[PDB]
Design a protein around this ligand. Sequence first.
Ligand SMILES: *[C@@H]1O[C@H](CO)[C@@H](O[C@@H]2O[C@H](CO[C@H]3O[C@H](CO)[C@@H](O)[C@H](O)[C@@H]3O)[C@@H](O[C@H]3O[C@H](CO)[C@@H](O)[C@H](O)[C@@H]3O)[C@H](O[C@@H]3O[C@H](CS(=O)(=O)O)[C@@H](O[C@@H]4O[C@H](CO)[C@@H](O)[C@H](O)[C@H]4O)[C@H](O)[C@H]3O)[C@H]2NC(C)=O)[C@H](O)[C@H]1NC(C)=O
Ligand SMILES: *[C@@H]1O[C@H](CO)[C@@H](O[C@@H]2O[C@H](CO[C@H]3O[C@H](CO)[C@@H](O)[C@H](O)[C@@H]3O)[C@@H](O[C@H]3O[C@H](CO)[C@@H](O)[C@H](O)[C@@H]3O)[C@H](O[C@@H]3O[C@H](CS(=O)(=O)O)[C@@H](O[C@@H]4O[C@H](CO)[C@@H](O)[C@H](O)[C@H]4O)[C@H](O)[C@H]3O)[C@H]2NC(C)=O)[C@H](O)[C@H]1NC(C)=O
Ligand SMILES: *[C@@H]1O[C@H](CO)[C@@H](O[C@@H]2O[C@H](CO[C@H]3O[C@H](CO)[C@@H](O)[C@H](O)[C@@H]3O)[C@@H](O[C@H]3O[C@H](CO)[C@@H](O)[C@H](O)[C@@H]3O)[C@H](O[C@@H]3O[C@H](CS(=O)(=O)O)[C@@H](O[C@@H]4O[C@H](CO)[C@@H](O)[C@H](O)[C@H]4O)[C@H](O)[C@H]3O)[C@H]2NC(C)=O)[C@H](O)[C@H]1NC(C)=O
Ligand SMILES: *[C@@H]1O[C@H](CO)[C@@H](O[C@@H]2O[C@H](CO[C@H]3O[C@H](CO)[C@@H](O)[C@H](O)[C@@H]3O)[C@@H](O[C@H]3O[C@H](CO)[C@@H](O)[C@H](O)[C@@H]3O)[C@H](O[C@@H]3O[C@H](CS(=O)(=O)O)[C@@H](O[C@@H]4O[C@H](CO)[C@@H](O)[C@H](O)[C@H]4O)[C@H](O)[C@H]3O)[C@H]2NC(C)=O)[C@H](O)[C@H]1NC(C)=O
Ligand SMILES: *[C@@H]1O[C@H](CO)[C@@H](O[C@@H]2O[C@H](CO[C@H]3O[C@H](CO)[C@@H](O)[C@H](O)[C@@H]3O)[C@@H](O[C@H]3O[C@H](CO)[C@@H](O)[C@H](O)[C@@H]3O)[C@H](O[C@@H]3O[C@H](CS(=O)(=O)O)[C@@H](O[C@@H]4O[C@H](CO)[C@@H](O)[C@H](O)[C@H]4O)[C@H](O)[C@H]3O)[C@H]2NC(C)=O)[C@H](O)[C@H]1NC(C)=O
Ligand SMILES: *[C@@H]1O[C@H](CO)[C@@H](O[C@@H]2O[C@H](CO[C@H]3O[C@H](CO)[C@@H](O)[C@H](O)[C@@H]3O)[C@@H](O[C@H]3O[C@H](CO)[C@@H](O)[C@H](O)[C@@H]3O)[C@H](O[C@@H]3O[C@H](CS(=O)(=O)O)[C@@H](O[C@@H]4O[C@H](CO)[C@@H](O)[C@H](O)[C@H]4O)[C@H](O)[C@H]3O)[C@H]2NC(C)=O)[C@H](O)[C@H]1NC(C)=O
Ligand SMILES: *[C@@H]1O[C@H](CO)[C@@H](O[C@@H]2O[C@H](CO[C@H]3O[C@H](CO)[C@@H](O)[C@H](O)[C@@H]3O)[C@@H](O[C@H]3O[C@H](CO)[C@@H](O)[C@H](O)[C@@H]3O)[C@H](O[C@@H]3O[C@H](CS(=O)(=O)O)[C@@H](O[C@@H]4O[C@H](CO)[C@@H](O)[C@H](O)[C@H]4O)[C@H](O)[C@H]3O)[C@H]2NC(C)=O)[C@H](O)[C@H]1NC(C)=O
Ligand SMILES: *[C@@H]1O[C@H](CO)[C@@H](O[C@@H]2O[C@H](CO[C@H]3O[C@H](CO)[C@@H](O)[C@H](O)[C@@H]3O)[C@@H](O[C@H]3O[C@H](CO)[C@@H](O)[C@H](O)[C@@H]3O)[C@H](O[C@@H]3O[C@H](CS(=O)(=O)O)[C@@H](O[C@@H]4O[C@H](CO)[C@@H](O)[C@H](O)[C@H]4O)[C@H](O)[C@H]3O)[C@H]2NC(C)=O)[C@H](O)[C@H]1NC(C)=O
Ligand SMILES: *[C@@H]1O[C@H](CO)[C@@H](O[C@@H]2O[C@H](CO)[C@@H](O)[C@H](O)[C@H]2NC(C)=O)[C@H](O)[C@H]1NC(C)=O
Lengths: 244, 244, 48, 49, 49, 49
Amino acid sequence: LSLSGNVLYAVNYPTNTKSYWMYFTVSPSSGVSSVDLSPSTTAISFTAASRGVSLSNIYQFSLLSVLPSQVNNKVQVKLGTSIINLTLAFSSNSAGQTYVYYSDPNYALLALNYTLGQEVKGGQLTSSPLYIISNTSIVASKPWLKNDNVFTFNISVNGTEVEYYAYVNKTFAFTYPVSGFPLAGSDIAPAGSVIGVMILFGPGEATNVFQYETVTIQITPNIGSPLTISQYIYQPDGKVTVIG
Amino acid sequence: LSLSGNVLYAVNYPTNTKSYWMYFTVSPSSGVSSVDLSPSTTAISFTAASRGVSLSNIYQFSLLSVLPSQVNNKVQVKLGTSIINLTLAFSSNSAGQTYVYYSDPNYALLALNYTLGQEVKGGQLTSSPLYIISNTSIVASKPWLKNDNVFTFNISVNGTEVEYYAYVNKTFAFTYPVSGFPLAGSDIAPAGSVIGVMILFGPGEATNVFQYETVTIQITPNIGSPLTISQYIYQPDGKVTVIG
Amino acid sequence: VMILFGPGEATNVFQYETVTIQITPNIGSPLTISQYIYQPDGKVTVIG
Amino acid sequence: LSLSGNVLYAVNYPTNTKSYWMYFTVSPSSGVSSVDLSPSTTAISFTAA
Amino acid sequence: LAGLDTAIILIAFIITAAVLAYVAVNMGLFVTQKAKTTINKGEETASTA
Amino acid sequence: LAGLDTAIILIAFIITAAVLAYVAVNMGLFVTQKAKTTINKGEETASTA
Ligand SMILES: *[C@@H]1O[C@H](CO)[C@@H](O[C@@H]2O[C@H](CO[C@H]3O[C@H](CO)[C@@H](O)[C@H](O)[C@@H]3O)[C@@H](O[C@H]3O[C@H](CO)[C@@H](O)[C@H](O)[C@@H]3O)[C@H](O[C@@H]3O[C@H](CS(=O)(=O)O)[C@@H](O[C@@H]4O[C@H](CO)[C@@H](O)[C@H](O)[C@H]4O)[C@H](O)[C@H]3O)[C@H]2NC(C)=O)[C@H](O)[C@H]1NC(C)=O
Ligand SMILES: *[C@@H]1O[C@H](CO)[C@@H](O[C@@H]2O[C@H](CO[C@H]3O[C@H](CO)[C@@H](O)[C@H](O)[C@@H]3O)[C@@H](O[C@H]3O[C@H](CO)[C@@H](O)[C@H](O)[C@@H]3O)[C@H](O[C@@H]3O[C@H](CS(=O)(=O)O)[C@@H](O[C@@H]4O[C@H](CO)[C@@H](O)[C@H](O)[C@H]4O)[C@H](O)[C@H]3O)[C@H]2NC(C)=O)[C@H](O)[C@H]1NC(C)=O
Ligand SMILES: *[C@@H]1O[C@H](CO)[C@@H](O[C@@H]2O[C@H](CO[C@H]3O[C@H](CO)[C@@H](O)[C@H](O)[C@@H]3O)[C@@H](O[C@H]3O[C@H](CO)[C@@H](O)[C@H](O)[C@@H]3O)[C@H](O[C@@H]3O[C@H](CS(=O)(=O)O)[C@@H](O[C@@H]4O[C@H](CO)[C@@H](O)[C@H](O)[C@H]4O)[C@H](O)[C@H]3O)[C@H]2NC(C)=O)[C@H](O)[C@H]1NC(C)=O
Ligand SMILES: *[C@@H]1O[C@H](CO)[C@@H](O[C@@H]2O[C@H](CO[C@H]3O[C@H](CO)[C@@H](O)[C@H](O)[C@@H]3O)[C@@H](O[C@H]3O[C@H](CO)[C@@H](O)[C@H](O)[C@@H]3O)[C@H](O[C@@H]3O[C@H](CS(=O)(=O)O)[C@@H](O[C@@H]4O[C@H](CO)[C@@H](O)[C@H](O)[C@H]4O)[C@H](O)[C@H]3O)[C@H]2NC(C)=O)[C@H](O)[C@H]1NC(C)=O
Ligand SMILES: *[C@@H]1O[C@H](CO)[C@@H](O[C@@H]2O[C@H](CO[C@H]3O[C@H](CO)[C@@H](O)[C@H](O)[C@@H]3O)[C@@H](O[C@H]3O[C@H](CO)[C@@H](O)[C@H](O)[C@@H]3O)[C@H](O[C@@H]3O[C@H](CS(=O)(=O)O)[C@@H](O[C@@H]4O[C@H](CO)[C@@H](O)[C@H](O)[C@H]4O)[C@H](O)[C@H]3O)[C@H]2NC(C)=O)[C@H](O)[C@H]1NC(C)=O
Ligand SMILES: *[C@@H]1O[C@H](CO)[C@@H](O[C@@H]2O[C@H](CO[C@H]3O[C@H](CO)[C@@H](O)[C@H](O)[C@@H]3O)[C@@H](O[C@H]3O[C@H](CO)[C@@H](O)[C@H](O)[C@@H]3O)[C@H](O[C@@H]3O[C@H](CS(=O)(=O)O)[C@@H](O[C@@H]4O[C@H](CO)[C@@H](O)[C@H](O)[C@H]4O)[C@H](O)[C@H]3O)[C@H]2NC(C)=O)[C@H](O)[C@H]1NC(C)=O
Ligand SMILES: *[C@@H]1O[C@H](CO)[C@@H](O[C@@H]2O[C@H](CO[C@H]3O[C@H](CO)[C@@H](O)[C@H](O)[C@@H]3O)[C@@H](O[C@H]3O[C@H](CO)[C@@H](O)[C@H](O)[C@@H]3O)[C@H](O[C@@H]3O[C@H](CS(=O)(=O)O)[C@@H](O[C@@H]4O[C@H](CO)[C@@H](O)[C@H](O)[C@H]4O)[C@H](O)[C@H]3O)[C@H]2NC(C)=O)[C@H](O)[C@H]1NC(C)=O
Ligand SMILES: *[C@@H]1O[C@H](CO)[C@@H](O[C@@H]2O[C@H](CO[C@H]3O[C@H](CO)[C@@H](O)[C@H](O)[C@@H]3O)[C@@H](O[C@H]3O[C@H](CO)[C@@H](O)[C@H](O)[C@@H]3O)[C@H](O[C@@H]3O[C@H](CS(=O)(=O)O)[C@@H](O[C@@H]4O[C@H](CO)[C@@H](O)[C@H](O)[C@H]4O)[C@H](O)[C@H]3O)[C@H]2NC(C)=O)[C@H](O)[C@H]1NC(C)=O
Ligand SMILES: *[C@@H]1O[C@H](CO)[C@@H](O[C@@H]2O[C@H](CO)[C@@H](O)[C@H](O)[C@H]2NC(C)=O)[C@H](O)[C@H]1NC(C)=O
């Protein structure tokens, strides 16, 4: 795997007391062969040596497994009386193959939230580490949400800004398709695909922002060489900051 | 890919409350080899770090796929009783090859509008994110057009100014040929071609103008190194402003 | 060596796929040919 | 046998909806000995997994 | 024997060089555009008064 | 006789080459990213004043 975009970092700017997520993009190196990215086989490690944080494997979920029909028209927004179904997985056709991708991390998060909620409902998963809501009133009735890490994001629906609050239990990573991915259902990144990797921080690692510190991420698939990513992080300069 | 023109930015000047589009031009670097620009394989990302906007892939459509016969004489203007067919894709012959291009972004937009309308009619696409009309009276009957992003442009037909209103659903990018492109139908930019890239902003990203901010665009084809474009944007100074 | 495709295998183009050909004569080791095929770029395309 | 040329592939370009032929060239390896290529005895297999 | 282990190392070294090529070209495109922007801002700074 | 001892050494030499391949690619990915970061910091250093 090659790192094939900048590394983005998000914090409670300008206050800088708390850490939200990191995002970056990967693709198979030089287009030579495919990479298995299934989270049962692959590990993603995260270390911040200066502060003694060392996580051996945070990778848990992938939207590469998910067909568009499992997520599209399945989360919905209420605007007064009116109710609007969302499209989250976009798709296009070339040479009789359907390519699948998410246009941004926000639609990927909503698609993941739904997928995990559905896996919990089906008894396949014990608890979701991620919980996304638009209504903050609910939180008073769910005290476990009081203490875990929370960040917000906004989407436009019917030209109206909708704010979502994402509650994260523990630091975890997930992957999703960005381009060149016709293999929906498979967890395999083919040569000439682009895969988004997103790390969400839980209350442990979130506790204060990375400053004057080295952070290292490593992705290790079951075959082939691992990708090692390292950045010395200066102070974050905006809501999102470019670190690498 | 090399950036091979200035980067142009358009806003609701002078009021500067809303953002319309960005345009720039690309060509294969140093004329060494061709680049695959098919939107199923290629990604175009857009980030404005300061405001936390981060889109992993906005690329959706290309007019490189389109033969002139699919767009020429297929959109028409009514001037009283008289009706005029438009030519949008221009063409010239060298060494038995037909080169194809669009003279400006306005003719490219009209050609794209038609192409997408036709793909929706043929059931190949679920909805067009772009809808262009000259008649504003229609809008009252189509309330979904009330809330999405709108900008205008003018063409001269029969020496008369015709104003078109372009309604955009979501932020997206498309590509079109500008010169040196004989490979009509292919999505491949050959060495010594020039390709226009246009980004249209939807109601989410349009909401206020870029000022005192860094904007980054990256184009990542399925083979070869990506092109990364970054500008610090001062206040916009006209209907179109040169940012890079 | 020329391979012509019939209506079965012709039905859509090879893209983002591995194709393998093997020639096995009656004596000696077979020749195994494998290509990952990206999108075809012309009337004829060079795949390997 | 050695592969002794490039592998060529032909399609209904630019439309790319249909596949026509593949061509390649072979020769006995390192010039050491001859190869029987009779189609009653030899097989050529083709797979697109 | 040696016609295999050498081939594997060649594959790896090619990929290693291709990775540097990928990074170097991308970063050259980036930095040269920063230079373009700077040259423009320098001319604006010298002209505007 | 010889159709076995040779095969074992081949297996071992392949694994040995694969181990170098694994390390070389990983370390190339690492160092090229350090170079990317350095080039960015160099441009920041030249621009900021
Ligand atoms: C997105 O959000 C938009 C608002 O931001 C929505 O547009 C508004 O929808 C109202 C309900 O109608 C829609 O319902 C579904 C949506 O799921 C659509 O598929 C339908 O096509 C339908 O259009 C609509 O209200 C009207 O319908 C009522 C009966 O259902 C009727 O009582 C109202 O009078 C309206 O005709 C909106 O249309 C405009 O509404 C305003 C009033 S208000 O803003 O709705 O309160 C009317 O203005 C005037 O109000 C004055 C009072 O100051 C009165 O004196 C006057 O008599 C009255 O005319 C407009 O005339 C009327 O056009 C509509 N808003 C607009 C701008 O068109 C949209 O549906 C949402 N889309 C989705 C998919 O959810
Ligand atoms: C992220 O994923 C979360 C799950 O991990 C989602 O939370 C779940 O939301 C359900 C409703 O989702 C819809 O409405 C919201 C706004 O309310 C929209 O934002 C969404 O887009 C979507 O359209 C919610 O279902 C209940 O509330 C609904 C209110 O609209 C109502 O229509 C339903 O009928 C439900 O009552 C989930 O709440 C839980 O639901 C389960 C049943 S089910 O899984 O929904 O089928 C209940 O279990 C029941 O418990 C009772 C005991 O009280 C038993 O007797 C019964 O047998 C059993 O079925 C739970 O009690 C109830 O809490 C809600 N789930 C959680 C874990 O909170 C979230 O919406 C997703 N985010 C987004 C943006 O979509
Ligand atoms: C992170 O990890 C936390 C701890 O591991 C999780 O907290 C637990 O959440 C349960 C479900 O709530 C949430 O589910 C999804 C995850 O799948 C979340 O994303 C949503 O935010 C959603 O709210 C919660 O269960 C309760 O809510 C359920 C509906 O959501 C409902 O079906 C249950 O019956 C519960 O009411 C946990 O709360 C615990 O509930 C158990 C009962 S049960 O086994 O859950 O059914 C209680 O056990 C009882 O204890 C009492 C005495 O206290 C005894 O009398 C009784 O015999 C016994 O059953 C626990 O006391 C009670 O805490 C909640 N647990 C904790 C420890 O926090 C969290 O969901 C994870 N994810 C996120 C995003 O935060
Ligand atoms: C987000 O979530 C909020 C609460 O979780 C929702 O607000 C609740 O909805 C009702 C009011 O309508 C609201 O709707 C619009 C659009 O959403 C809001 O913008 C408005 O500001 C407005 O608040 C209200 O329900 C009451 O009226 C119902 C009949 O219309 C009736 O069935 C209910 O029982 C309520 O009386 C809610 O008020 C509270 O409602 C809860 C129940 S529920 O959350 O509505 O399901 C009641 O709990 C009850 O408590 C008794 C004990 O006294 C129990 O015995 C019973 O089992 C239990 O149901 C509260 O007593 C009551 O005060 C209102 N809740 C709040 C906190 O505002 C809101 O609509 C959601 N969406 C948005 C966009 O904000
Ligand atoms: C582009 O738009 C132009 C106008 O801005 C158009 O030119 C005008 O076309 C009129 C209709 O004719 C054309 O129709 C098709 C277009 O699809 C062409 O291919 C044809 O070749 C044809 O020329 C034309 O009107 C005339 O034709 C009428 C019958 O069809 C007749 O009733 C009129 O009298 C005209 O002969 C225009 O020609 C001029 O028209 C004016 C009147 S008006 O401006 O049309 O109303 C005449 O002026 C005089 O008017 C006074 C009243 O003040 C009378 O008293 C007097 O008797 C009358 O002569 C001119 O004499 C006459 O030349 C024509 N305009 C011009 C300046 O030539 C053009 O067709 C459009 N092109 C396309 C491709 O759409
Ligand atoms: C951009 O692309 C848009 C599509 O995404 C185009 O919108 C479509 O415009 C059609 C007419 O275009 C011509 O006229 C306009 C000015 O009106 C010119 O600017 C254009 O250059 C061009 O010359 C329009 O067709 C209808 O209106 C015509 C009025 O002139 C009329 O002649 C036609 O006969 C049509 O009635 C589209 O409106 C939709 O048309 C479809 C059918 S079709 O796709 O046109 O073949 C209708 O579907 C029908 O629905 C009925 C139910 O009511 C069914 O029973 C029937 O089976 C089914 O066919 C729609 O109902 C009707 O709305 C219009 N399309 C949309 C989505 O609005 C736009 O013009 C393009 N922009 C430019 C500048 O060209
Ligand atoms: C952006 O994304 C929006 C939402 O995803 C799109 O809005 C939807 O546009 C539909 C088509 O209109 C437009 O089509 C092109 C895109 O291809 C646009 O560029 C043009 O502006 C053009 O106007 C619209 O469908 C309606 O118009 C069609 C003709 O244009 C017509 O064939 C349909 O039958 C509709 O009248 C969507 O409106 C929705 O229509 C469905 C029915 S259908 O599936 O579309 O046929 C309604 O469902 C019905 O709901 C009622 C109750 O409300 C039920 O009783 C009934 O059983 C059920 O069928 C929806 O209610 C209604 O909203 C419209 N949808 C929304 C949510 O906005 C938009 O086109 C995209 N592009 C742009 C440029 O804005
Ligand atoms: C842009 O779009 C406008 C509306 O979408 C168009 O205006 C409509 O055209 C007719 C008038 O002629 C216009 O033509 C020139 C050049 O375009 C304009 O510059 C003029 O200013 C002028 O306005 C008019 O049609 C009426 O007359 C017809 C016979 O000549 C008749 O068939 C129609 O039914 C109309 O009575 C329009 O007036 C409205 O028309 C709509 C239908 S349509 O939009 O014309 O197709 C009617 O809706 C009807 O409503 C009834 C309920 O009462 C329903 O039962 C029926 O099914 C439905 O058809 C309205 O009632 C009626 O008022 C006129 N519309 C408007 C709003 O002005 C215009 O020409 C287009 N082009 C330009 C360049 O502006
Ligand atoms: C684009 O076209 C519109 C109309 O075709 C122009 O608006 C006209 O502006 C003039 C004065 O500049 C007025 O006399 C007309 O009445 C207007 N037309 C209408 C229909 O209202 C607009 O100025 C044009 N803009 C550009 C930049 O070309």
